C-alpha cells in the first residue's frame, strides 16, 4: 500500500492496491486419432527391387 | 520351417521320375528364398541337381542337365521336380533343401527336407 502512495505514511481509508490470478498449472496438447501412416514399409520391405 | 517330399518311390527302368516338395515356413516370393534338390545313393556322396530361386533362375547340374525339368507351383506352395529315363544307378534318396538369407552372405541348405528313398527296378 505504501508502494502505491509513495508516502512512509498511509491515512486511515481502504486502497486498491493491485490484483491477483492464479497462475495455469499446466500445459497440454490435443490432437486427433490420426492413425494413417504412408506406405514406407512397402518401398523399404520390397519383395523384388 | 517344413519341407517334405512325395511322389512314387519305385519305377523301372526307361521310365520317368515325379516328385513334389510341398513346403511351410518360406514363400518362393521374397527374395534371397530358393529350393533346390540333392540326391545320395546308398552309402555314397551327395550329388546336385538343380535349384530354383525365387525370381526363376533354373539352374542346372551340366552332366544332369538335358534330362531335368525343375519348376515350381507357387499358388499350391510347391515345387515340382522331374528327371526322364530312369535307372537303377540312379537309386538314391532325395532331398527337397532350403537356402535363404544369412547375416553377411546367403545361408544355402540350412534346412533339409526328410528324403524319398527311390528305387529303379523290377
Known sequence: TKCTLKSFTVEKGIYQTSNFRVQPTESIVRFPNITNLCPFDEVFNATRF | ?122
Not at chain 2, 510341398?22 to 546308398?42: A, D, E
Not at chain 2, 551327395?46 to 530354383?52: D, K, N, R, V, Y
Not at chain 2, 552332366?63 to 519348376?71: D, G, Q
Request: proline content about 6%.
Open chain 2, 1 to 122: 520351417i517344413t519341407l517334405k517330399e512325395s511322389g512314387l518311390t519305385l519305377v523301372r527302368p526307361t521310365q520317368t521320375l515325379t516328385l513334389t516338395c510341398t513346403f511351410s515356413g518360406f514363400s518362393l516370393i521374397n527374395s534371397g528364398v530358393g529350393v533346390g534338390w540333392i540326391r545320395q545313393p546308398p552309402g555314397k556322396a551327395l550329388e546336385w541337381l538343380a535349384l530354383i530361386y525365387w525370381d526363376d533362375d533354373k539352374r542346372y547340374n551340366p552332366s544332369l542337365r538335358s534330362r531335368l525339368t525343375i519348376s515350381k507351383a507357387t499358388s499350391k506352395n510347391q515345387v515340382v521336380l522331374t528327371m526322364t529315363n530312369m535307372d537303377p544307378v540312379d537309386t538314391a534318396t532325395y532331398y527337397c533343401t532350403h537356402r535363404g538369407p544369412g547375416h553377411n552372405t546367403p545361408i544355402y541348405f540350412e534346412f533339409w527336407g526328410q528324403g524319398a528313398l527311390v528305387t529303379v527296378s523290377s
